[PDB]
Design a binder for these strands. Structure first.
Ligand SMILES: [Mg+2]
Ligand SMILES: [Zn+2]
Lengths: 674, 26, 82, 226, 63, 49, 625, 237
RNA sequence: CCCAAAAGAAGUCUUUCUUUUGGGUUUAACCAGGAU
């Protein structure tokens, strides 16, 4: 998220068009964007088109125009002279394609090759007029979109939601590198800056969970400190742990400590889960998802979140504000946790309704106890306090003495309402976490750990995921192309040292030059047995599953594989909310809004037309009179309800009297005749 | 690749890219 | 041929609509009867008043409105429109 | 045409922690169901023992860093969740792990009291470089199935106590197959081959016996109608 | 004038109504929503709003 | 409306709106559009006081 | 008629009711103690909570609430977790998917507010869309696929019926569906195999009933022989008892027809129970249908290359003609567009021919579950032409299918047109609300006030104009102009007696009888001619589309019409003559059209002079004025 | 260990022979563990008897119709198939049904030898017209489950004998469901609901008891390995 | 309407009744970022 936020181009701001005043001619993708602004990555809301991401290879020239590299061809010979061109020069010349048949001597195989003319036309020009060629494929895709495997099989519409749902993952407690990546993880991780990189070559002296000592080659020594459980701007942990031992030797630029979402220097936003593609009992109906319970017991998906609470003892004109322990008119039990100063001891579970700070300010005893309490809906241990004091000559805000600040942390497991989602854009909300015994399990007893619907794949045109699934399995089980008597034809161009892989072998398929379909068929045709001489996935890639709930085998084979799915930051615990009676506004007596204060839902404008259309009148009257702003109606209905009486009649709404006063303020003699 | 201690991640790529990716925060 | 309606769906709505002109009349009918029954329950220990009922056997905790509807089905009440 | 045989069960030992039980001859169609019933009972309702809570020297909460260990304290908790304990007492017991000095710290160092016995010495707990000391106290307890963290406040406890999730499941992996014989003369039967694999806490025979007892209890409930 | 004022062109509607001294008879569905009174449609109309329920005489005798 | 009278304009509006909706395969019963068209044709303009 | 509620929300919405019941049961001496109990969640509050919410309706709503069915009253039941559980058969009414949607819960309090949440807004009492009368609680997606798999007759399957061979009697004859199920459980019979059974709990079809029983009916208990698949017997066992035997493959249209007929001829409760049972069967069977997607199931046409080369030759010839000056730029572009359109159609046809009939993709597409054939062509055969930012077709065109993987340039020119789709979606969903608001505000005072105006005016309906050679071809769009009306006059044909009397609902039987009699035009009542001073009458408005009976005397028809003419506003695309949402806006607004067309004023012949830069027309009046 | 809540078994009689047993709270995994097993045990483990094959005079080659009888061969076959008969002799016994003259044959017209009995004597089988005669021989033996028609083992042994399907089990149809039943801080328990339908030879109660016995025997065979093993217990009745 | 503190009385080993004081809007407007 940070790396993509630094490379952003926004067309809205001081001196630029506005979100509500942009036509449909500025949000499109002009044919001059090729290689200068990714056409896939873009927000989905009303900003679509006004915000974009700079491509991988682009640079900004001194005047501020965006330039891209091109490899120049002289006399049909593809040299290596890289020339940076802006839009105009690219317009003037003719440019070929990156993935063209080079004959190993910088010469095209056939005279005709796709090119881009002046105005973005695509045509066939003989291989004698070509003036430039793309340095490589992928040149049009930004950093986020370059990390989607099999991108060229997915429609743009779903690749967009795939590139906008990698910036919303959540650093899990333990991270794991994906089985099938795209070779772009390493560079993104190292550049994003969340990992620690040895500044100079040397040998490790001592390693510990807090710091690492490197003894450079020439006397000097350096100590790298580590961020342990530090809050980020959006409430996720920021751990860092070493990956080197006390005797290893490091080199300049080497990765020496993981980050929030890194695993040995590679981006790791999620986990590899065993996935089947059958519809199951309707629980995964309409994009829903089903998880096994193994993803709860073993903390496969378990996030850590940290909340910050602040309070300032203002000097005030009256003076004497102090953070004291003794809370006026308080019980002994509720004051038990607080330390001598009046700050909760670090290591106590402050569930909703406890004290964190004891603050009393003059009434203008004559004081008000604004003792900061855990707001509604929080819990978890207290992992860190920080108190700044005026007496310690700190840089405090003018007119205060103390700024005690507390942190509370909690581990959230996966549960109903979360928003798991793959990479290609197969978002869903966990529907039912079944126990580990009734899950479709393969012939050898391994239970599948997730289930996806078939009806969602073909219609949305994101077939890519299925391909990934297949490849995932080939990565997990490990294969061995049998070159006993000549290499098979489908593996002729397969690179060396890829004819065979050990189990749990990681592979990479670049975005636009990857694994062809024939290669996938060949790999699936040969795969090692698991423990005994059994193969669980036949050539088509589909296995035979036993139904755990009833016992009988499913009549037809099903697709199974390994897919890399994440956990999005739209958890349920931050969304659920209810209100019986709580705070009310001041100018108008309606209830407030938002989960923080207490909040009550809004019965909007076009939710009073449905009630009118139904013909229900009493419900509408009570939803607008004795539930929102009739001052006596509220207390009377509360009393009637607790005492079992029949609910009373409504009066008139306060906002109407506010309207009458506002009209009268304009010199309009409004009067309520009879 | 070129990072001294990166994990060995094999690739299916057929082409070769003459130019390394520039500094992503440059 | 209703199988065995359970809960808020019992009795069937069609047989109730048989008793009145339109669902709108049935709404107010049932609401007024429920209010009368609730007043009787709150006043049962106090002095007697005209309001009577329930005309059917009360359940364990059957909420007032439900009972009212059950009565409309048995044809034990009559109404007049405005 | 009533078959004149009563089902019989035999065992084959593939290794210490795996076995294959063969049950035959069953009625046609009654192999998959029986296998699935035994599998369901095996994987959810076998009692075992596990660690419930731990206390480490210099850690009030569980998001800190003990001085001298390469890993954090959360990592030590995750690594201590793979232990395979087998207790015999029905009340909480206590275990102590003590180390001081350079080197590794494995489960094997754990000193169990009479009764409980760590069954896989050597897994990995944590590494100590030069100046670290690990003096940790564990609480083994019996149970069944799964039990989320026993909240510290709800169950009276101190401030240095770290609740840990418990998994009292000895059975690791179960499967089955059926060898149906559909002859032309309609004298049919199945033959259930059920494969069990436990995590070295209890031999598979005992897991099968416990499942048998539970199912006998329930279907005996079913029987006593008249 | 209340409904028109709440629909669009609030300033113009208010000013011309003020000039003409229009008196708004309260009938419709938007103004009765504004002033918190039963809409004159659906269950709110007079025919169904003044129903009179009363136990039958046979049941009264049986008690 | 000025040429063929009210009935013609009513049928014309209903047919045009229904054509627009049908072209996209959406079914709307005509009485709704007739209600709206009734609401449009309510007033009259004075030519001689 | 049930919805899940997470008990932590239920404990909060029903707080006062819980406190009262706690006090009554002597679990707390006064109100404050009960409040403390509820705040601290003692183990007993739950026991009373479940007793409080019993038969207490709760309103569920989603935003935006486009049409009337956006707010529905359910009965709450406690569930574990933190997510509201919703019934799958209402997702269409709310237009709610499960990709992270959020829904709001309101609670009615007074006695009236509860009554209006059990008789007007209960979920099971709104099965028919108010706009057009089609059902909305119909099975969809997985359910349709499951049922389509269930009621299919695959030739030459296991246990198929086999006529007598002369050495053994007939095989595949079963004496009751119980025996068929018992055999199916043993693997000797397949749920989709044709057999002959002896039914005694299903009513036989019309023809079989007439030619076998006659008399009055089958009188449940009498037995008849049926040749069908066990699956179809299972399905017909879900429909009500009196419904005839439906022996057909249940394509989505057929299920829609069946549900519509049930709603027409039965009360609403039976329809609700039937849709519930259909849901259960559909979900149970969709799991066994074996509908999975794997790249071995996305077959490619066998001869794509030959076709592509053949049309590439034509493109080459057109380009060479352009280079020699035989035609300008636009002519070349048009010719190439035509050639490539033909190539796309040919590849699509070959792809349609190649696939078997049981492939998962074509099983999903053909069964009406979801999708159309265009997406399958895009997935397997060839994408075809793509659009420029302006809107003109790129003459390249794309030539690779998403299974084979596009190249770089093709992907770019695809995103070109892909983005404008999202842009227009956003802007049109923004616009539609304005139109809905104006329509609601114009037609908010049309309320049914009287029962019958007793007028005689009315409109005339086309009603299946006569054929040239002589035949009554039914007007295709009759379901939206002649059903659910009330005749204003009587229908008389060829001096015959009145076929339909004045004031009749004019349903399917009436229209069928009218066509059989041989009359093409009828005069029906309409709100356009209603004679009540304020609001429309009841007979003039006619049948209420949602209820199925004559509208009531308090309904607010105006708002229903406003919402129905504005809910299908997202579907209607925004595509110099306007032809999308702008056309509707400039129609209702009564603006002068963008490109006006001067219509004639008086009959006669017309003289046209084709002047320079503009035409000139003159109307010759027959009158001569 | 202890289960902490005993299950219960209650029955709701619907017809003379049809029941609906409910098994209330089970631990939240055993809703299906004993549902499917109990269903299968009911369907395919209760001994019974049925007609294995028949021979009808005058029908040797053509199996379309029987002279002197109204109904065709298949109708007679599938009328005799659903004949409830109870037997004790393990060997296949033979019965003869013969009637002359016009009228209506009934299941009570058969003369059973010792041991074999018929539980629905008043069953229509065939009709005779114009001095017609019917004479059919049945062979009855006791089996288990549902055994499809068995083709001839020795064709030369008999030519008129034609095999038929055998419905040995006395239980005809069974189905089961599960729900959720508790408000005690855990709304996730299971409630099993069976639906047993049986012939007029064994009331559903006895069928359920017999199924219970068989399952107890099998899982006791399972338990026999280690008698003193720790497992869940429900306690006393 | 509701909560907190102090005193008196009754019983229970901790709830009810009476009197005094204190009290209740985490409001609000902007800009920004997200969801369907
Ligand atoms: Mg959605
Ligand atoms: Zn009228």
């Amino acid at each position: 998220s940070g790396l993509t936020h630094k490379r952003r181009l926004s067309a809205l701001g001081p001196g630029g068009l506005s979100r509500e005043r942009a036509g449909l001619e500025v949000r499109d993708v002009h044919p001059s964007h090729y290689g200068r602004m990714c056409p896939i990555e873009t927000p989905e809301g009303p900003n679509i088109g006004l915000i974009g991401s700079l491509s991988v290879y682009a640079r900004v020239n001194p005047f501020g125009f965006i330039e891209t590299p091109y490899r120049k061809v002289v006399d049909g010979v593809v040299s290596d002279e890289i020339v940076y061109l802006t839009a105009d020069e690219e317009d003037r010349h003719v440019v070929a394609q990156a993935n063209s048949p080079i004959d190993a001597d910088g010469r095209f195989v056939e005279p005709r090759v796709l090119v881009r003319r002046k105005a973005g036309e695509v045509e066939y020009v003989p291989s004698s007029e070509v003036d430039y060629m793309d340095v490589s494929p992928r040149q049009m895709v930004s950093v986020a979109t370059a990390m989607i495997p099999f991108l060229e099989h997915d429609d743009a519409n779903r690749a967009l939601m795939g590139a906008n749902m990698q910036r919303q993952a959540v650093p899990l407690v333990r991270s794991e590198a994906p089985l099938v990546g795209t070779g772009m993880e390493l560079r993104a991780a190292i550049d994003a800056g969340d990992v620690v990189v040895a500044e100079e070559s040397g040998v490790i002296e001592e390693v510990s969970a807090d710091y690492i000592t490197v003894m450079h080659d020439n006397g000097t020594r350096r100590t790298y400190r580590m961020r342990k459980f530090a809050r980020s701007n959006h409430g996720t942990c920021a751990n860092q742990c070493p990956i080197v031992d006390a005797g290893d030797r490091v080199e300049a630029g080497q990765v020496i400590a993981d980050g929030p979402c890194t695993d040995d220097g590679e981006m790791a936003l999620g986990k590899n889960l065993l996935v089947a593609i059958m519809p199951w009992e309707g629980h995964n109906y309409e994009d829903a998802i089903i998880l096994s319970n193994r993803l709860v017991e073993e903390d496969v998906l378990t996030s850590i979140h940290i909340e910050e609470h602040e309070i300032d003892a203002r000097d005030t004109k009256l003076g004497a504000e102090e953070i004291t322990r003794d809370i006026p008119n308080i019980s002994d039990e509720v004051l038990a946790d607080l330390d001598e100063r009046g700050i909760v001891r670090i290591g106590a579970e402050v569930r909703d309704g406890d004290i964190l700070v004891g603050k009393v300010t003059p009434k203008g005893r004559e004081v008000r106890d604004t003792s900061l309490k855990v707001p509604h809906g929080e819990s978890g241990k207290v992992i860190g306090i920080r108190v700044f004091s005026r007496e310690d000559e700190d840089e405090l805000p003018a007119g205060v003495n103390e700024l005690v600040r507390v942190y509370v942390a909690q581990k959230r497991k996966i549960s109903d309402g979360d928003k798991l989602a793959g990479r290609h854009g197969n978002k869903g909300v966990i529907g039912k976490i079944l126990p580990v015994e009734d899950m479709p399990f393969l012939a050898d007893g391994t239970p599948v750990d997730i289930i996806l619907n078939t009806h969602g794949v073909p219609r949305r045109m994101n077939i890519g995921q299925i391909l990934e699934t297949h490849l995932g399995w080939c990565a997990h089980s490990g294969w061995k192309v049998d070159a006993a008597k000549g290499v098979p034809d489908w593996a002729a161009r397969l690179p060396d040292e890829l004819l065979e892989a050990q189990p749990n072998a990681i592979v990479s398929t670049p975005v636009f030059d990857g694994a062809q379909e024939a290669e996938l068929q060949g790999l699936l045709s040969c795969t090692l047995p698991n423990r005994d001489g059994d193969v669980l996935v036949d050539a088509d890639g589909k296995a035979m599953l036993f139904d755990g709930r009833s016992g009988e085998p499913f009549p037809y084979p099903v697709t199974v594989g390994y897919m890399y799915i994440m956990k999005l930051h739209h958890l349920v615990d931050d969304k659920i909310h209810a209100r019986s009676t709580g705070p009310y506004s001041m100018i108008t007596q309606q209830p407030l809004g938002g989960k923080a204060q207490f909040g009550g839902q809004r019965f909007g404008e076009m939710e009073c037309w449905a009630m009118q259309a139904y013909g229900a009148a009493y419900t509408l009257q009570e939803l607008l009179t004795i539930k929102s702003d009739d001052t006596v109606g509220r207390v009377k209905v509360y009393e009637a309800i607790v005492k079992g009486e029949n609910i009373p009649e409504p009066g008139i709404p306060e906002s109407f009297k506010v309207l009458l006063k506002e009209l009268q303020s304009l010199c309009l003699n409004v009067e309520v005749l009879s | 690749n070129s990072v001294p201690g990166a994990p060995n991640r094999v690739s299916f790529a057929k082409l070769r890219e003459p130019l390394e990716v520039p500094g992503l925060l440059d | 041929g209703y199988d065995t309606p359970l809960g808020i769906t019992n009795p069937p709505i069609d047989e109730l609509l048989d008793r009145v002109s339109s669902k709108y009349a049935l709404v107010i009918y049932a609401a007024k009867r429920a209010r009368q029954i609730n007043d009787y329950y709150n006043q049962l220990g106090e002095g007697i008043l005209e309001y009577v009922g329930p005309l059917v056997e009360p359940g364990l905790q059957e909420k007032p409105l439900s009972i009212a509807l059950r009565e409309i089905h048995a044809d034990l009440l009559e109404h007049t429109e405005g | 045409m009533l078959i004149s045989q009563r089902p019989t069960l035999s065992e084959d030992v593939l290794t210490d922690n795996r076995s294959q039980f063969v049950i035959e001859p069953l009625e046609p169609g009654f192999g998959y169901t029986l296998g699935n019933s035994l599998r369901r009972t095996l994987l959810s309702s076998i009692p075992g023992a596990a660690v419930t809570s731990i206390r480490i020297d210099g850690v009030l909460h569980e998001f800190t860093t003990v001085p001298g260990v390469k890993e954090d304290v959360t990592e030590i908790i995750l690594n201590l969740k793979s232990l395979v304990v087998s207790s015999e007492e029905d009340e909480p017991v206590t275990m102590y792990l003590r180390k001081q000095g350079p080197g590794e710290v494995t489960a094997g160092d754990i000193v169990p009291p009479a009764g409980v016995t760590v069954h896989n010495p050597g897994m990995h707990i944590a590494t100590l470089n030069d100046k670290g000391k690990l003096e940790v106290e564990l609480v083994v307890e019996r149970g069944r199935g799964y039990v989320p963290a026993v909240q510290n406040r709800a169950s009276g406890a101190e401030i240095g106590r770290i609740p840990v999730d418990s998994i009292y499941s000895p059975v690791l992996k179960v499967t089955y197959k059926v060898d149906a014989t559909r002859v032309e003369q309609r004298t049919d039967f199945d033959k259930l081959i059920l494969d069990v694999e436990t995590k070295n806490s209890i031999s598979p025979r005992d897991a099968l016996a416990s499942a048998g007892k539970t199912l006998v209890e329930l279907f005996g409930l079913a029987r006593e109608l008249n | 004038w209340l409904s028109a004022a709440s629909f669009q062109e609030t300033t113009r509607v208010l000013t011309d109504a003020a000039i003409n001294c229009r008196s708004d008879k309260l009938n419709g569905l938007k103004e009765n929503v504004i002033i918190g009174k039963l809409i004159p449609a659906g269950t709110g109309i007079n025919r169904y709003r003044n129903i009179a329920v009363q136990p039958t005489e046979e049941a009264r005798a049986a008690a | 409306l000025r040429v063929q009278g009210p009935r013609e304009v009513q049928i014309h509006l209903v047919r045009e709106v229904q054509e627009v909706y049908r072209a996209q395969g959406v079914s709307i019963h005509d009485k709704h559009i007739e209600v709206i068209v009734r609401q449009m044709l309510r007033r009259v303009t004075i030519i001689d006081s | 008629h049930q919805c899940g509620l997470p008990k932590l929300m239920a404990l909060e919405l029903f707080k006062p009711f819980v406190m009262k019941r706690l006090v009554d049961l002597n679990h707390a001496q006064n109100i404050k103690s009960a409040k403390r109990m509820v705040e601290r969640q003692r183990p007993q509050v739950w026991d009373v909570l479940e007793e409080v919410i019993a038969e207490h309706p709760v309103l569920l709503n989603r935003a935006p609430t486009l049409h009337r069915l956006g707010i529905q009253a359910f009965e709450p039941m406690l569930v574990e977790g933190k997510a509201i559980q919703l019934h799958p058969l209402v997702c269409e009414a709310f237009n709610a998917d499960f990709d992270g949607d959020q829904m709001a819960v309101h609670l009615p309090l007074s006695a009236e507010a509860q009554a209006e949440a059990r008789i007007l807004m209960l979920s099971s009492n709104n099965i028919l869309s108010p706009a057009s009368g089609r059902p909305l609680a119909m099975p969809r997606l997985d359910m349709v696929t499951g049922l389509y798999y269930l009621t299919t007759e695959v030739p030459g399957d296991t246990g198929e019926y086999q006529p007598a061979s002369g050495d053994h009697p007939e095989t595949g004859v079963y004496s009751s569906p119980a025996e068929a199920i018992m055999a199916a459980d043993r693997g000797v019979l397949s749920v989709r195999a044709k057999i002959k059974v002896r039914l005694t709990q299903l009513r036989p079809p019309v023809e079989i009933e007439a030619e076998l029983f006659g008399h009055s009916g089958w009188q449940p208990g009498d037995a008849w022989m049926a040749e069908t698949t066990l699956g179809r017997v299972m399905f017909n066992e879900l429909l009500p008892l009196g419904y005839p035997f439906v022996n057909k493959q249940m394509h989505k249209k057929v299920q829609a027809a069946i549900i519509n007929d049930l709603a027409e001829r039965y009360p609403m409760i039976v329809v609700a129970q039937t849709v519930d049972k259909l849901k259960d069967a559909g979900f149970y069977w969709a799991t066994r249908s074996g509908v999975t997607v794997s790249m071995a199931d996305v077959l490619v046409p066998p001869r794509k290359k030959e076709i592509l080369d053949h049309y590439e030759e034509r493109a080459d010839k057109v380009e060479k003609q352009f280079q020699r000056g035989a035609l300008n730029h636009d002519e070349r572009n048009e010719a190439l567009v035509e050639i490539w359109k033909e190539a796309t159609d040919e590849v699509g046809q070959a792809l349609r021919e190649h696939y078997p009939d049981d492939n998962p993709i074509i099983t999903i597409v053909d069964s009406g579950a979801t999708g159309n054939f265009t997406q399958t062509r895009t997935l397997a055969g060839m994408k075809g032409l793509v659009t420029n930012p302006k809107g003109e077709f790129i003459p390249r065109p794309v030539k690779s299918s998403f299974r084979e993987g596009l190249t770089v340039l093709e992907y770019f020119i695809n995103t070109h047109g892909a983005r404008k789709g999202l842009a227009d979606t956003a802007l049109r969903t923004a616009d539609s609300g304005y139109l809905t608001r104006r329509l609601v505000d114009v037609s908010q005072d049309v309320i049914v006030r009287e029962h019958d105006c007793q007028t005689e005016r009315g409109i005339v309906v086309e009603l299946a104009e006569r054929a040239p050679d002589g035949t009554l071809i039914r007007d295709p769009y009759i379901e939206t102009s002649a059903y659910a009306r009330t005749l204003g006059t009587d229908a008389v044909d060829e001096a015959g007696n009145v076929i339909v009397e004045r004031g009749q609902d004019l349903g399917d039987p009436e229209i069928d009888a009218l066509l059989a009699a041989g009359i093409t035009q009828v005069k029906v009542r309409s709100v356009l001619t209603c004679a009540t001073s304020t609001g429309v009458c009841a007979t003039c408005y006619g049948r209420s589309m949602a209820t199925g009976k004559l509208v009531d005397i308090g309904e607010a028809v105006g708002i229903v019409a406003a919402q129905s003419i504005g809910e299908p506003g997202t579907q209607l695309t925004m595509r110099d003559i306007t032809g999308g949402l702008p056309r509707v806006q400039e129609l209702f607004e009564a603006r002068v059209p963008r490109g006006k067309a001067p219509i004639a004023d008086v009959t006669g012949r017309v003289r046209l002079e084709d002047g320079e830069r503009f035409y000139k027309i003159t109307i010759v009046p027959d009158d001569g004025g």
